[PDB]
Amino acid sequence: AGDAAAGQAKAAVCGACHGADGNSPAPNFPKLAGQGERYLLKQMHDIKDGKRTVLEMTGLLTNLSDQDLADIAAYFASQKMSVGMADPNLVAQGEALFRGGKIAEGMPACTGCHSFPHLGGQHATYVAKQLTDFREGTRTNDGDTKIMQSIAAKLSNKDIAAISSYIQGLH
């Protein structure tokens, strides 16, 4: 159990890339605001011990205690993710995939598990990178099941671009 109030100051070093409140202004860096505390904490441990490699964060988590990480996670989880706009040329394809999946190819809809990390409002650039990394097996911290890797295997590049654009505007 983290202390959100204590996490705010401990999160100051993170704001340079993720935003003071976790709402990053630049699309390369993911928004952390409003993300689930348990998801955030798991990603922090995965990044810290190398199960998920984020070279841009090398050395930042090294000296944070497990309590420090829980406080920071609690702080970001207490914020609210800001919501962007979808591209009108892509949003229909992206929303149809998000709500309906690809029934023909046995791909479940995203709404089954993602309303679990929060997705709605996340930068499209960041989401597309994660879906592509999942598909290519470069991100592998999705458990022994490899659910996201198996799901992203069914998405084309056009699918990923459209779903990512839809998610960016989702609220």
85 marked among binding-site residues = no
| Residue (38 or 85) nearer to ligand HEC, CB | 38
Could you tell me the smallest distance in angstroms from the CB atom of residue 110 to ligand HEC? 3
The H or E element containing residue 64 is none
> Can you tell me which residue has the tokens 């479940």?
108
CB 30 within 8 A of CB 122: yes
81 marked among binding-site residues = no
The conformation of residue 56, written as its DSSP 8-state character, comes to G
Could you tell me the smallest distance in angstroms from the CB atom of residue 128 to ligand HEC? 8
Q: How far apart are CA 157 and CA 11, in angstroms?
A: 35
The conformation of residue 31, written as its DSSP 8-state character, comes to P
Could you tell me the smallest distance in angstroms from the CB atom of residue 72 to ligand HEC? 5
| Residue (82 or 141) nearer to ligand HEC, CB | 141
Cα 132 to chain centroid, rounded: 13
Residues in contact with ligand HEC by CB under 6 A are 13-14, 16-18, 28-30, 32, 40, 42-44, 54, 56-57, 60-61, 72, 108, 110, 112-114, 117, 119, 127, 129-131, 141-142, 147-148, 151, 163
Could you tell me the smallest distance in angstroms from the CB atom of residue 55 to ligand HEC? 8
| Residue (9 or 113) nearer to ligand HEC, CB | 113
Three-class secondary structure of residue 25 per DSSP: coil
Alpha helices in the chain (DSSP H): 4-10, 15-18, 37-49, 66-78, 91-100, 124-136, 147-152, 157-168
107 marked among binding-site residues = no
For the annotated binding site for heme c, the residues are 14, 17-18, 57, 110, 113-114, 148
Annotated binding residues: 14, 17-18, 57, 110, 113-114, 148
